[PDB]
Amino acid sequence: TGIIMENVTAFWEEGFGELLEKVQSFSHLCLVGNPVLKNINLNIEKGEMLAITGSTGSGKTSLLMLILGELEASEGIIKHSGRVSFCSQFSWIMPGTIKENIIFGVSYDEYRYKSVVKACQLQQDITKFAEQDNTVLGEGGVTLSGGQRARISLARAVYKDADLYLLDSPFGYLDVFTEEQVFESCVCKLMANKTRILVTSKMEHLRKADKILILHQGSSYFYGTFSELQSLRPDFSSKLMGYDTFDQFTEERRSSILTETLRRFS
Ligand SMILES: Nc1ncnc2c1ncn2[C@@H]1O[C@H](COP(=O)(O)OP(=O)(O)O)[C@@H](O)[C@H]1O
Numbered sequence: 001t002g003i004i005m006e007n008v009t010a011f012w013e014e015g016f017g018e019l020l021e022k023v024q025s026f027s028h029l030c031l032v033g034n035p036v037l038k039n040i041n042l043n044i045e046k047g048e049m050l051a052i053t054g055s056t057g058s059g060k061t062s063l064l065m066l067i068l069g070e071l072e073a074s075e076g077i078i079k080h081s082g083r084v085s086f087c088s089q090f091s092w093i094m095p096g097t098i099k100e101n102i103i104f105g106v107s108y109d110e111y112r113y114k115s116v117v118k119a120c121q122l123q124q125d126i127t128k129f130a131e132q133d134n135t136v137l138g139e140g141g142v143t144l145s146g147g148q149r150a151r152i153s154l155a156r157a158v159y160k161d162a163d164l165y166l167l168d169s170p171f172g173y174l175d176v177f178t179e180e181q182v183f184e185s186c187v188c189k190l191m192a193n194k195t196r197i198l199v200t201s202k203m204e205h206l207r208k209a210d211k212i213l214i215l216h217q218g219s220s221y222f223y224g225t226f227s228e229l230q231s232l233r234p235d236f237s238s239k240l241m242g243y244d245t246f247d248q249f250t251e252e253r254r255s256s257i258l259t260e261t262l263r264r265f266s
Contacts, residue, residue, distance in 0.1 A: 001046060001082035001163040001195060003067070008040045008076030010066055019070055023088050023168075024061055036062045036071065037218050044211055047193040051205045054215030055259035060199045061089070063215070064166050067197070082163025087156070089168045089199075091149035093141035098126060099133040101141075102155045112159065119190040120155040121182050147173040151182065158186060165196040172201070172251035180204075180247075201254040202247040203240055216262040235265045 012034045017026030029036075037059045044050045052060055065071040066078070068086060094101055102122075103113065117123060117133070125148050126132040141149055154170050167187070171179040187198060188208060198205055206212050207226050214221040214229075214236075222233050230237045239261050240246065246254060 001080050002048070003042065003044045003050075003080035003164060003195065003197075004078065005040050005042045006077040008066070008073045008078055009035050009038045010062070010071050011074050012036055013072065016062075016065070016071055019065065020061060023065070023090065035218050037066070037215075040076070040213075040220055042211065042213055042223060044195060044197075046195055048195060048210035049187065049191075049208070050197045050211045050213060051209035052197060052199045052213045052215065053201055053206060053258060054213075054221065055217070055262040056255050058215035058262075059218045060215055061168060063213075064168055064197070064199070067164070067166060080164055083161065084164045084166060085157045085160040085162035086166045087154050087158075087168065087170060089172075091146075091153035093137055093139050093149060093152065095137070095139055097131075097134050097136055098122075098129075098152055101137065101152055102133075102159055104156055106160060115190065116155050116159045119182075119186040120151045120158065121178055121185065122151055122155055124178070125151065145173070145175070147175040147178060151178075154182070154186065158191065163195060165191065165194055167196065168199045169201075169251075171205075174250070176248050201251060201258055204247050214262070216266065221262055221266075233265075236261060239265075 012026065012029035014030055016036070040063065042050060052063065054060055062071060064086065066073060067080065068084065094104060102116065129135040150170050150173065154167065157165065157167065171183060173179065183205065187196065206229065209226060211224065212226060212229055213223050222229060224232070
């Protein structure tokens, strides 16, 4: 499946801020009648990758909830059909082995498993443990690094057979060379033909995306190709492409540069 949004708007409604909270004054935002997103348009073909970036708290997560149906479109048309698979920014971990976490509630299939494991770069993790992917974890799997938890929860989501993959900021940790190999192997090759939406703050991901959506304040700052971006948003581009290794700054620096840049160039 592809995905289409034509001129979609969505309001704060009772309970969405708390959902937002799990997944990453609400009353007043529902009382007053307020768009969390306004005039969103995107059109994404089967098998393409949409990269979503923007300033912090611009509605990135919220756009995924709307896809998931947890937020409601008060206006506009959304089309997409099929199973969706959601990897949240929170990396949840269930009691059981690493392997049991990746296949959680889904049947085991060897070729599929081994291939997901290799492309999420889990082979370098599990090889440090005496029982490898049979190692037992407690929930939160709290002695692992953030990147280890995020790769296991990415592998779980990519292993789900679905028509659309929603991946909310997996690449936000310090082990930055691993993240680059995950993006190239999992998101770019293994998933090359699965429709997919990657929320992100690395410019390489916009560079390889089929489509790009930049959000600011609940609003679409830009939407189209990386090439259209360089030509239609030149102040944004020149500033962002003008660092020499932006993608290796910490997630917080990158997101703060993005926010400031989006603030400057509205
Ligand atoms: N944990 C939170 N507590 C209070 N307000 C929040 C929280 N998370 C997001 N918001 C607010 O809700 C709106 C939408 O946030 P969100 O969709 O999470 O943006 P983003 O994913 O781009 O960082 C923003 O206006 C933001 O300030």
